[PDB]
């Protein structure tokens with residue numbers, strides 16, 4: 130409903146089912162969600178991992194060209210601009226099929242790409258056969274009056290990855306994902322801790338339903354710094370819209386910790 | 391009841407209220423618990439942080455001598471031997487009042503000290519006024535057919551500390567604590583994640599009730615590798631007895647993580 134007193138940031142998460150290797154269909158879904166989110170006064174939409182081509186790592190490696198990726202990227206940039214909403218998407222990276230990773234990018238409501246990130250923690254042998262892991266820490270940047278960061282899927286299950294973002298100043302960590310197999314412990318146990326242990330908010334935007342041989346969990350959720358869900362979805366397609374309102378980060382003995390991992 | 395098929399390790403946690411600066415009283419309580427635990431077929435008893443002198447950091451620094459600490463330590467070693475149970479305790483360290491930290495030690499059922507550890511992550515200004523922080527990673531050792539480790543209180547709230555133990559092979563992490571102020575998120579949110587994110591079991595033995603100006607939470611708990619409580623206490627004194635039955639540790643990119651904390 131109306132924008133509340135004490136909140137100047139409203140975000141949206143898109144949860145849906147992608148069709149493998151059908152970017153027109155899947156990008157039309159992101160466009161629809163971008164329009165709906167903007168109508169509802171959201172200033173940013175987060176969408177799921179690899180949504181544009183579907184979560185089909187081996188098929189992306191075998192069949193999706195770098196020109197096809199760039200064409201998708203250009204369409205997404207255009208969605209951000211034309212729907213007047215900041216947009217986080219996740220595509221293969223821009224290099225050739227043998228050299229690219231899984232990425233997330235944030236465009237602002239003018240369509241400018243503010244940040245780009247390559248997934249550091251690849252999940253399972255199919256991802257590691259299809260993609261090159263990232264080697265750079267998560268980006269952190271000002272938008273909308275806070276410091277935003279990006280991570281992708283499996284990354285968030287590693288406390289080190291979230292801590293890397295929070296150490297750079299992140300307040301709001303945005304995470305495209307693709308989580309199947311009724312893995313309740315990720316949103317149920319790990320995300321709340323990542324929020325509490327850093328004092329941050331995290332947004333986690335999943336696929337749902339039958340896609341590419343898997344049944345995705347849905348369960349998209351925004352978790353606040355107390356570890357509580359600010360909003361959550363179930364297993365069906367939906368558009369989650371949320372208004373956002375111990376000193377672990379200082380106390381940690383990072384110079385010892387770094388020697389002990 | 392009877393020792394179950396498929397479990398060859400039964401542990402006990404002591405939850406109680408200590409009297410500040412009364413080691414005879416508090417060590418008599420640990421002796422009583424050691425006896426009871428052994429009667430119930432437990433092979434190890436875990437007891438809470440600083441229990442022997444009470445959780446009174448400033449008063450420990452002002453009033454408790456190194457000879458008084460050693461006298462307590464010797465009594466505890468004797469409890470382990472005479473009650474025929476492995477024992478984890480937590481005392482000030484052995485150095486002078488200005489030079490020592492908060493420690494945890496494991497004695498076996500013969501009274502041999504197998505491992506010693508000094509709290510790395512001190513909590514709050516009173517602890518940091520009264521104690522020197524530890525500089526060494528958590529120890530890990532074979533006992534009872536598994537790899538055990540020690541951490542103390544606030545340490546476990548840092549994912550880095552638990553990961554440091556798990557990286558050395560820990561399977562069972564034993565944590566004396568002193569948690570007051572209705573801090574539900576520690577046992578409710580953080581401990582389950584520490585277990586899941588490493589694939590380990592954690593045991594967390596708290597004070598309870600009025601002690602030294604604080605009201606301790608109780609809530610002692612053993613959490614298994616799925617993040618579920620294997621046993622838990624409420625807010626009253628008690629003796630918790632539990633039978634114990636993604637490849638994050640391999641997948642983590644530790645050589646990058648270490649540069650990003």
Ligand SMILES: [Cl-]
Pocket residue numbers: 266292293294296297649650651
């Ligand atoms: Cl960092």
Ligand SMILES: [Cl-]
Pocket residue numbers: 388389390527553554555557558
């Ligand atoms: Cl280590």
